[PDB]
Amino acid sequence: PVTINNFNYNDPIDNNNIIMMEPPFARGTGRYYKAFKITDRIWIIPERYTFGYKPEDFNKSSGIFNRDVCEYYDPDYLNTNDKKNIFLQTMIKLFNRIKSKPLGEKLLEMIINGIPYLGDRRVPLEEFNTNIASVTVNKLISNPGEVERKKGIFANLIIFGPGPVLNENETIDIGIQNHFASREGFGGIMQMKFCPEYVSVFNNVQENKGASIFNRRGYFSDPALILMHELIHVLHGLYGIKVDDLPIVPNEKKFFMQSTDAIQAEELYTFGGQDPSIITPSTDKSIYDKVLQNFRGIVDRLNKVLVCISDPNININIYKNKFKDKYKFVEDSEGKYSIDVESFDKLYKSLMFGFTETNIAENYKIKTRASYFSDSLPPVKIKNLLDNEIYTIEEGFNISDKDMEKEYRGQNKAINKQAYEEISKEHLAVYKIQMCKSVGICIDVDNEDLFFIADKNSFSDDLSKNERIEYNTQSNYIENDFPINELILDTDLISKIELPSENTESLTDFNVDVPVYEKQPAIKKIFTDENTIFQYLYSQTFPLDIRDISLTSSFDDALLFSNKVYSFFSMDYIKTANKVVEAGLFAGWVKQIVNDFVIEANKSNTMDKIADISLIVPYIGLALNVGNETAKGNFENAFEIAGASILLEFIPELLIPVVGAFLLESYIDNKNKIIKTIDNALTKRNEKWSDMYGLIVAQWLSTVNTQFYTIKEGMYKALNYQAQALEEIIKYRYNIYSEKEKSNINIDFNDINSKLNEGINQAIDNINNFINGCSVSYLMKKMIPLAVEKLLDFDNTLKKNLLNYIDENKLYLIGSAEYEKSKVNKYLKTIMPFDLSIYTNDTILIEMFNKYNSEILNNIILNLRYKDNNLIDLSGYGAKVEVYDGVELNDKNQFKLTSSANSKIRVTQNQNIIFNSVFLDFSVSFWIRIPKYKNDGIQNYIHNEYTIINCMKNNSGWKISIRGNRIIWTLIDINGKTKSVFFEYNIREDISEYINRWFFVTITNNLNNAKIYINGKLESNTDIKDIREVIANGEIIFKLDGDIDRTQFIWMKYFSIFNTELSQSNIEERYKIQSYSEYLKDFWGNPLMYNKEYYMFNAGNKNSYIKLKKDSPVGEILTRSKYNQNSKYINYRDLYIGEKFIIRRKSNSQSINDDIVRKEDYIYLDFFNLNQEWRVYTYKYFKKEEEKLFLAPISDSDEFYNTIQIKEYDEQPTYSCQLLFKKDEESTDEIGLIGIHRFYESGIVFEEYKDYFCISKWYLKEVKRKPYNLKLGCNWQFIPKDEGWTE
Ligand SMILES: [Zn+2]
């Protein structure tokens, strides 16, 4: 257990627990400091840390010490005895809180017992030397006013009060002759500058601060955790493992890049959480090896130490026993010490991955920042840590008796205001970047708001080095983790070996290096005429001395005029926001504009499914203009084309090493040492794949995800500025009114802010999900594949290497050289899938990843779409697409393949995607329109099969072909085995749903089956168990290849490939999404058009057509003629028959050219009677349920309705449409729908039933029924002449 001593600052010096100490950096000169022993080996000196600092620097100036800290200055802190005493009691309380739990008690016990080795690198192996500044510190015994008597003592930690900046706590180690004992295995006296009351503040982006943008946001820190973070640094230093290695260094070559000090792995390790993942596995192992090498030197010293010359009183045995336990060395029955790999690994991981800020915060239920790389906010001052009403040893601020325990409410600035006080900005210093244009106008930007983008030099290239494979050789992995619960329950972790007495001989060698610090300018001026994120955010603010503003969509005007504020919301929102109204209409306007704000913010949930994008925040580009000028043009379109990459401010240059070669050493006449060497070489290969992925993850997190974090913070700021500006306008407009008027205005400013704030929160959630999605997208599509390429190349070089190795050892291997020959082929066959959870256990990151992999659209590895008269792959994997001259393309995403040699498309797939999952698993989807057979060429039509899409490599692959009315899917494995599955549609149907009409195809493949779906419905299935490996990433050739007629062609649309098996549910959804349109379609499935001749088809009377009756102004219904030749293979009803109709637009007199017919449009349904254009009318006053339509010349009669409204009552995909007659466009009076009705006729000669073109009210209720009745006589389709259908 740990005992915390009690004392008052004014207690008498006793030269034991209360002394006058001579601090290490005083060099044995100057004055002494009253120090108090809080626990064994730990001292508290309640005075400012002045070593290396100029006296005047304790005052706030135009300079700063640290470029990334909101620095608070106060030279009076600790300037009285009472203040010193409060510091003392507060430190006592914090140590008590720390030991209130086993984990913290153990951190303290480890520190107290982790006594520095007696010496350093300069000391002979056979000696213990206490006469060095990192081991002994002196205390003055003599009377005041004279240093006539001093004594030495051993110490572990000395905690001082703060230096110039109160909130910049720091742990410092002692260097002597350019070296640090605390970094070379020995350990040494550690020092700290600490301030308990002025704590850091942080806000979580992925979350909310009480969800109040009008209230204070963020959470303040628990000083006990802040102290424990430093104590972890102390721990590292005491055990001599606070080593230096390759640091993460920020790129600072661009003006938008954040400048900060190099960051050591020891810092990211100390913080924990996701940060250790920014340290590559390569560097993790480098650090591990350095520490182990340091411990080897110490264990050698314990075997050789014989005396202590500096202190004759030192019992050599007592210390050897203590250092043995400290470093967990093992000792044989003779006293020989050695390193135990298991105990070392456990100790090392406990110290680096067990005791971390993140782990301690979780255990003490204290909230803290999510990462070292997060924006820092202004610190605050805790009112009184010694008041149990606000802070307790047991619960800190989160006191359950005050219900401040749940959701860390006690640390919430918006909730626990009684616990802290804000700091006067006049005492805060912050490093800013002044961005000026070449004119002059400048903008100040806090350094913390810039993008942190690690430079390429931050990452190790150890993966390029060669590796020697021996029978000995084994894998090397360092789990950046440690079971916290076993640490807490460890029975041998905490020492039970005697702590030596602290008194020793006086220190006489005061040699030591004292750091020297100095402030630097708080403002750096740069020049740039760029208008990126910082300028765009700035254009959304206004000066404090201005109160009357107006919004504008002009960024330029916003920068120019102080009373103009930029808004990225709609034109209507902006106009309404600047509207001035009468008092009586103000409450109405307020409700209106606030509602508009919410609607605009809500557009962050926009979907773009037709482009295969589930979520898109359309206004991000207008809001920040971040990345590649995202504010210009249409953002959704630009994102559809380039994806996540367009949002990044900078495209990082990734380090992706050419993996080094393997040197396999032979052992002639040794069957085992050879087989082992091969086994080891194979496992080592996996280490290379894992380490490579780790390198990528480290770079992604420190160069890409950091940028997306900045964008998220940026959108939060943008949305808040928008709300603040609106709030400003509302206040101004309201204060223009008199008191008499205000009294009668019904406004509730708090409900207004509650609604704006809610709208913002909703938007932020959408934005966070969108950006997180973009980040993972970049990692998976723009980073992982580039590493896979190098890794696959490595595999190839290693493959021949191993096979040739087996070759040179064929004798010594005998009958097995072939067995292992294939061992190499199959092992290097299955490639390592990337799994982020292997490199991190951070919940936020893991969930992001899992979410990404749970979205079927992220499985799209090829998506050919039309863009500026060309077809390109928009899957994000960058396939090369060559569209040759004979291919016809249009903006409807349809492309035509003809019989010409140059009507071809060549696609080169990305070779670095997991497609070969070693069991077949992928899908292909597309729409196709196949022309009708030529009546006089039916034999060749049913006989000649021709390929349309072929993808082969090494005579293995897949292919799509057609033979007349059948479409076929074929697979061919590496052996030549073939399997096929097909869909054949009937060519003897009176009316076909497939011939020359657009339909949706989807083929899926898994280990057992190959299935073909048509329009979402399963049609065929073939068992493909016998099929082995099928190479599917070969080149894809779209071209009609076979014995085809010159007139043969095929139309295709939306070709895509998925690297997984789509479910029936996925396919049905894709069918519906890709079928959707605002326009109606024609019989063939193309867009319905105005001013285009069409024959009419009735889905309820398929074989019937309309013809103007010879003796009456009505349309009689006749039976379609049919195919008349003798072929036994075909039958159909003529389609080009009956009156030739034409749809005319009602609105706008923009003449009669052509255009697209949309749902709900008002139209005129006309037709040609010889050289004249007639029209379809409905007699206004019929009283029956239905009546015959009136067909006559164009004219306007008060007795006839002439306006039709084209409709679509079916919710599912269909090419049918309905035609409605309403009294007029405005009324809700429905006259009825156009259809067909049967009438009985009994004349003097003939008796019979006849159908006529009619309108009926009966259809009105029928179209409402579910499921939609496709057979209704009110369902029509328009058939235009088409080269794909001849009769
Ligand atoms: Zn730290």
From Swiss-Prot:
The keyword Membrane appears for this protein: yes
UniProt-reported outcome of changing residue 1259 to S: Greatly decreased toxicity, heavy chain has decreased binding to synaptosomes and dramatic decrease in GT1b binding
Disulfide-bonded cysteines: 436-442
Belt as annotated region, ranges: 477-528
Stretches the record annotates as C-terminus of receptor binding domain (C-RBD): 1076-1287
Database matches in PROSITE patterns: ZINC_PROTEASE
Region N-terminus of receptor binding domain (N-RBD): start-end pairs: 854-1075
Effect upon mutating residue 1259 to F: Greatly decreased toxicity, heavy chain has intermediate binding to synaptosomes, binds less GT1b
Regulation of its activity: Proteolysis inhibited by EDTA and captopril, and by peptides that encompass the VAMP2 cleavage site (Ala-Ser-Gln-Phe-Glu-Thr-Ser and Gln-Phe-Glu-Thr). Translocation of whole toxin into neurons is inhibited by toosendanin.
UniProt: Zn(2+) binding residues: 229, 233, 267
Binding residue positions for D-galactose: 1236-1237
Keywords of the record: Disulfide bond, Host cell membrane, Host cytoplasm, Host cytoplasmic vesicle, Host membrane, Host synapse, Hydrolase, Lipid-binding, Membrane, Metal-binding, Metalloprotease, Neurotoxin, Pharmaceutical, Protease, Secreted, Toxin, Transmembrane, Virulence, Zinc
Named cofactor requirement(s): Zn(2+)
Family under the similarity heading: Belongs to the peptidase M27 family.
Protein name: Botulinum neurotoxin type B
Organism: Clostridium botulinum
Gene designation: botB
